[PDB]
């Protein structure tokens, strides 16, 4: 139970580092000094604290999509709408708070290029494609439908090849992943290419005795890293 005092720019969090440490892809976020074939320091670098999503016994999972998560909310969103070209890293910090009398492991894992797919449905049709509000869910995220196949015919059983950290309320109450910019191009549109998709999956389902608050939250705190831009557009 380390003491907690963490603050930057204007934001201020209260976390710890006494158990789980830090997991990266094997490469810290950095800049580029190439031929491409503005560097905000005093505003963007602030802990944007998302909305605490609840967690029932009969939950299925959740998933956000960077940089869609912020594209419609925040100062970052502003200098994202005006720009067309984008590049950054992220300091995702997923934190759920609950008693010792609760239990239920989670799988915090980052899946780059999360192309999803839904069930063919309707009434009798053959073709359909996921709506804009499922490929770009936004800050609220989207509780997915079929966890076991990650809405892509992709089994969770092997997700651990990607960066992950377990949250077991017995042991761990903290999750921290640092993800670099990962793309075939050093720059891409922040609007039309949702990069990696963060997702939170309960494997060991939440359980409790009766009368123990049936809803333990998941506070998501994230921070961009080493953001970089060049040419700009005009404001309204």
């Amino acid at each position: 139970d380390r003491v907690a005092q963490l603050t930057i720019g204007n934001s201020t969090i209260t976390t710890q580092e006494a158990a789980n440490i830090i997991v990266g892809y094997g490469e810290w976020p950095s800049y580029c000094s190439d031929s491409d074939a503005t560097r905000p320091d005093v505003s963007v670098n602030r802990f944007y604290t998302l909305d605490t999503k609840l967690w029932e016994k009969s939950s299925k999972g959740w998933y956000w999509k960077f940089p869609d998560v912020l594209t419609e909310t925040g100062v970052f969103g502003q200098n994202a709408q005006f720009h067309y070209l984008y590049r950054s890293g992220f300091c995702i910090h997923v934190q759920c708070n609950a008693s010792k009398f609760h239990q239920g492991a989670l799988l915090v894992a980052v899946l780059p290029e999360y192309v999803i797919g839904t069930v063919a449905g309707g009434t009798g049709t053959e073709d359909s494609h996921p709506p804009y509000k499922q490929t770009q869910p936004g800050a609220d995220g989207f509780e997915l439908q079929h966890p076991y196949v990650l809405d892509a015919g992709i089994p969770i059983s092997q997700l651990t090849v990607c960066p992950h950290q377990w949250i077991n309320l017995r042991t761990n109450n903290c999750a921290t992943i640092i993800v670099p910019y990962i793309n075939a191009l050093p720059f891409d549109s922040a609007l039309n290419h949702c990069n990696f998709g963060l997702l939170v999956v309960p494997i060991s389902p939440l359980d409790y005795d009766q009368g123990a608050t049936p809803v333990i939250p998941i506070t998501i705190t994230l921070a961009p890293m080493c953001s970089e831009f060049a040419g700009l557009r005009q404001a309204v």
Partner: protein
């Protein structure tokens, strides 16, 4: 309620920074997190977090 507030009533103009300390009084077991935000004069109380 504060002594500060009362003394200031024996004066007119104030000036300076202020500390506000919150103390929690719950169980050792109860947890949860809350947001405390300061907002400068211009611009009002924000509708949502």
């Amino acid at each position: 309620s504060t002594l500060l507030g009362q003394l200031c009533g024996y004066y007119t103009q104030w000036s300076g920074s202020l500390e506000v300390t919150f103390m929690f009084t719950g169980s050792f077991m109860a947890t949860g997190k809350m947001l405390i935000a300061y907002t400068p004069p211009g611009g009002p109380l924000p509708k949502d977090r």
